[PDB]
Design a protein around this ligand. Structure first.
Ligand SMILES: O=C(NCCc1ccc(O)c(O)c1)Nc1ccc(O)c(O)c1
Ligand SMILES: O=C(NCCc1ccc(O)c(O)c1)Nc1ccc(O)c(O)c1
Ligand SMILES: O=C(NCCc1ccc(O)c(O)c1)Nc1ccc(O)c(O)c1
Ligand SMILES: O=C(NCCc1ccc(O)c(O)c1)Nc1ccc(O)c(O)c1
Ligand SMILES: [Ca+2]
Ligand SMILES: [Ca+2]
Ligand SMILES: [Ca+2]
Ligand SMILES: [Ca+2]
Ligand code: NA
Ligand code: NA
Ligand code: NA
Lengths: 388, 399, 392, 394
């Protein structure tokens, strides 16, 4: 049919595609050869590896959402943000997600028929958030009980590829782990339209909680332009911003694939859990922490930043394969993880202090090790000429 | 005994040392006199810092970088080079065709859909503009003055790197600039509906770049943003560490429905007194008024020249150019800034916007922008630092 | 009470000692005033002279140290909020040059709910803004309290701590002055910012300006005032001359007074006259020399006689008139209006290059005081003294 | 025959004037040559300490009039020498009074506000008569006399100075000066009255005080000065680029002495603390009270330190606290006063002196003078008028 003109163009373009593929392969192999000489230096993967999951930022993605919980009205999200422990920041045109008291989301009058978006856009453009400051973020919100879930279909992806195949759709299921130890009965899930931004999960009702935890199970499958699942092939899933304070541990567990250590990172694997195993990582000098997670006077501080060079201090990876992968990410009181005997002691700070049962987390391909070569080009197949 | 070759070397170095030593007092006196003049000028400018067109904090300009019409441009990219054939063809069709048929290259009317075919791709950069068989044509850049640009087609995250050489008039803190390496990257946060961006990178580095995602229709809630990372090099190919250099961020147009801005920049914002341009939330733009038409949206002057006094401020010759300009004080060898255009609704709510009768602030805009980053600071009477403090020559030791 | 019949008798002794001096001062001031009026009757039709010669018994020119108290049925505005509004929108530019440009203030940023205060707060080029400039009196210090009013709403100002002002020789100790937004004003918004200056002779700035000029627009403030003496007793004006000044008329805008007690008094040669119960530039503009029949330019420039719109300008009278007033309670509405609201385009002066239908900002600065702009008007400062009474 | 005698005496007076005309003309031409050479020389030193930035001669010779006679009118109250002396003997003043010192800046004017303090005519007071040998803060051991008035805001006193002996303007002898002092209504002193001590020597200026014994925050006293100079014939003398010395503008950490609302143009002395900003002449950028404090180069009172005592009438570095006003025309004016620093600028903008509160209250008083004693160095004086040849009587 008219297939022969697309064959002509594909054939004219095949040598360029092939040379690009071979050049990138050459560069990747040279980069890995060099990285083998620094694999035990700070910020490097201990086992050198390329990244074939190019998946760092999708700010223009469109989000669709199903749930067996309740959708929340954007009105209700706004109202809850305007009250209780968040109200202060709300009055300074700041959306403080970790201060949101979800008690004001639990009325039945707050429930919507479909997902509605909220964030620092629209009539709140120019506000900033705790997620990306004044960069614009939008999220749909659901209210879940233990065991209930929300399924997010992200489309309109523009920058993400898997071993050179374009990722056109991501279907992600967030489930509230029933073994979570939060004192409340509901969880607010703010699912960002950008899938690389992950989710904010909160059972916070305005007071801190001892021996508490919130854990979200994540099951995801990636799809190409044909709606065909993409089988991961030693893809590197970035698990980053695993903060550990003196009284709180952010961790991942129950995951497919193999933990991948970043050399010099506080994050390691112990008893099937990925977290800061031996030191804190909140403030320099406290509990063996090398750097401060927020920015201040000290050099190397502010590592809990997406663009921070020493981001890797709070990050690790998971080597994954297959089309369906999963991992549970959450926050838990230190006492749930280990006895107080085993804990680092920080002068003036009680390890038994309560913590807010909330967490912001994301799972993407933005691996935090340095000089990780990306696999962006697929080996092209020769075009076939159509039959007349 | 081949200590004769070293002896000839030593003797010619000993004559060059003697000439350098003969010229050192003159160089030192010139440097000290320029320092005296600059300090007196800054002391004088401190008395006008709250008057129209003056820097809020008086400062000298040690980045002499306004004019390089003869520069040579080489270009790398991870996108696709565009043939001059293809650029011409795209200019000859669609929303651009009209002006093309009047022998005018209207860059902001170019529909880049006719640049997205693969037969349009070249293996190396090709130049296009109002020269050759199009000499005498007009462009929206410098009217009929001759301009040339190379073209690339990039997706989000892709980039083009421009090496400008053959520089003739540019200096930084008195060190002559011999090479500029400049990387233009398509910001993935751009909100244009397409997937491609045409970059026209002008051979004159002071002319900046034209970026366009325009496909023939305006777009609501749209934006195009280009990240710029640059390093300047001297005669020896050694990077030049900026020392409070003033990078002019100029012609930041704000219409009723669209804002041109700079953000994510190294250095600190430098205000021009009375300018529409200020800084808010880490972005440099017309924060509180428009600057398109006198009387519309609080703007003091009209950007195009007409009957009204002070109009045509969006020109290079315009004495009130500073009305649409600001600066960035920068230091270090590697500097960066993202410049772009975005629909007003992306920046602030309609509640907060200036109201212009008869014009919808939510109107779509073309996702394109022309911008340039140079040393042509638009404040008035800014003294230039042209002379570098000389080091005494060292005597060579005999062989 | 036995001690007071010695303090009143000691204060009587001094009152009796100065009564001859007070009486001599009164009688010569009377002589000088009568001679001045006799002379002025010979120039009453010369430029800058009152058409009907008259003395000024309202000494009321400058009260920079007066204290201002304020009630309202509108909303008080926080000084913080006023500052914030000045820092934004059409004023921001001048604000960043340490200038408070009152006629450029976009009052939309005063209409938020946090902007309201429980009591009047002062703002101006004082305090942490000392050394700043205003469009009111340039580098001189001015302070004003601010309210946000709807049509028909009002603010009442009590000025005390007056130091230099007198009425029929009687010292003025208190002025009560009510500003009301005329509901017939045609501005496009629903709110008006009132900046009421602590110096009552500086009047008020009224603005409905929202960042855009407006066609067929107007802002009008009703003024009802009563003056009080030391004993807190109202003072009955007796042909007092109220100066209605700086009535600017551009090609598209007319500043005027109307609905006033008393009778208009013309200054000979002034652009200002009375027509259809309104006091304004009746026949010519007064903005630029040669434009619309205007003799002089209101701002200072190249031309002789320019800069008439100044307190110290010798030809200020070109934009001023008077109102002869009597009684204790007087009133007048002052405002600005688009020329199209006053007369058809048929009747308007034609200025090449300028559209008479151009929109204008719905704001105005005005003041009503005793600084009559006619020349050589003798002032009545001395009261005829009453003989003291002896206590018993 | 009765008028042929007058024609003969006019013919001898013409004969005399004609005999003196060549000498007068040669003297004038020689002084013009000397002044032009001096200005040519001064232009090469115009940016050195103590020099006028734009070199100029001084044609207002007006330094010293100790024998001048003063007459005074007012719309306020004349003060008796009785009352001035009594007030000097009491309150914040009394101490210095007991050591035979008249300390004007310590005078509590509260004891001038009673009614038998009032006189029908000006009366003089000072370190003369039974107080000869006393000291004043004006000229210390030199004899000075002043008449005193009590004014409210807007009230004024007009001084006619005659019997002038040493002062000239563009070569014309000054025979009379009429000078009006008005209390600026914008003054912020807490009081309601001002004492004006107007010295018989017009070059000594005036002392203005609203001081009632306590310092005042956010305070100010300002006196408006309007003056016209007259020649032998009673004709006003039209100034022609005369230099009016605006001097002793002291700026402490909490107080600024300044001039404003002036006819003419400000003239800067190179290296002086005094400059012009927003139409006001004062120490614009540094204090000038004590060396090292607030950027001040020298100490205003005399002590050990070199260059100190600059606030002196003879001090060679007088120019450190001085500027000038180039004036023309017959009627000139300027308002001089003292004001709390907070009235001029925010504390943010103020020079910082450790241990000293910039918001401290100050006494609302000031001594100032406006004369021709220009404090820049080597300013050539213009003493000779171009003479006109006499005309012969008929
Ligand atoms: O790395 C992070 N998060 C920084 C930690 C943080 C910052 C501020 C807080 O207020 C806060 O609670 C936590 N964020 C990120 C975002 C998007 C990504 O695509 C991505 O790959 C990583
Ligand atoms: O240097 C320039 N560039 C030309 C701007 C322009 C753009 C598109 C056109 O179509 C056009 O005609 C002109 N003029 C300028 C720059 C910076 C300024 O702040 C400013 O106020 C004026
Ligand atoms: O002296 C005043 N008021 C202040 C002067 C002024 C300052 C800034 C302005 O923007 C402005 O409009 C007016 N009234 C006056 C002056 C001149 C007249 O011809 C007259 O009739 C009244
Ligand atoms: O010499 C004078 N005026 C009299 C000095 C004086 C004033 C008040 C006193 O209380 C006092 O004791 C002495 N004027 C002057 C002096 C020094 C200067 O640097 C300058 O610019 C001007
Ligand atoms: Ca975290
Ligand atoms: Ca532009
Ligand atoms: Ca007016
Ligand atoms: Ca002094
Ligand atoms: Na975040
Ligand atoms: Na251009
Ligand atoms: Na005014």
């Amino acid at each position: 049919q008219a297939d022969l003109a697309k064959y002509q163009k594909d054939l004219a373009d095949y040598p360029v595609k092939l040379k690009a593929y071979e050049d990138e392969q050459t560069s990747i192999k040279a980069a890995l050869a060099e990285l083998e000489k620094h694999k035990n230096e700070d910020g490097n993967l201990t086992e050198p590896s390329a990244q074939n999951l190019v998946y760092d930022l999708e700010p223009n993605a469109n989000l669709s959402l199903t749930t067996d919980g309740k959708f929340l009205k954007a009105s209700a999200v706004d109202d809850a943000f305007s009250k209780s422990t968040s109200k202060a920041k709300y009055d300074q045109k700041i959306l403080q997600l970790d201060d949101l008291d979800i008690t004001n989301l639990e009325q039945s009058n707050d429930v919507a028929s479909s997902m509605e978006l909220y964030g620092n856009f629209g009539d709140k453009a120019g506000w900033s958030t705790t997620v990306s400051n004044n960069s614009q973020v939008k999220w749909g919100s659901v209210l879940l009980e233990r065991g209930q879930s929300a399924t997010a279909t992200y489309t309109n992806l523009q920058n993400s590829y898997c071993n050179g195949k374009k990722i056109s759709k991501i279907v992600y299921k967030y489930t509230v782990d029933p073994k979570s130890k939060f004192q409340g009965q509901k969880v607010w899930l703010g699912i960002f339209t950008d899938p690389t931004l992950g989710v904010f999960a909160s059972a916070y009702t305005g007071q801190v909680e001892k021996n508490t935890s919130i854990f979200i199970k994540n099951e995801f499958t990636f799809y190409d332009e044909d709606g065909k699942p993409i089988n991961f092939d030693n893809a590197l899933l970035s698990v980053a911003s695993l903060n550990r304070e003196h009284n709180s541990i952010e961790m991942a567990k129950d995951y497919s694939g193999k933990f991948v250590k970043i050399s010099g990172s506080s994050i390691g694997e112990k008893n099937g859990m990925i977290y800061a195993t031996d030191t804190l990582n909140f403030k320099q000098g406290e509990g063996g922490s090398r750097w401060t997670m927020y920015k201040n006077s000290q050099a190397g501080s502010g590592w809990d930043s997406s663009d921070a060079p020493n981001s890797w201090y709070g990050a690790g990876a998971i080597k994954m394969s297959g089309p369906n992968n999963y991992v549970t990410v959450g926050a838990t009181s230190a006492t749930n993880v280990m006895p107080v005997s085993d804990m680092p002691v920080v002068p003036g700070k009680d390890n038994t202090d309560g913590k807010k049962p909330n967490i912001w987390y994301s799972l993407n391909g933005k691996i935090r090790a340095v000089n990780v070569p990306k696999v962006t080009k697929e080996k092209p197949t020769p075009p076939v000429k159509p039959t007349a």
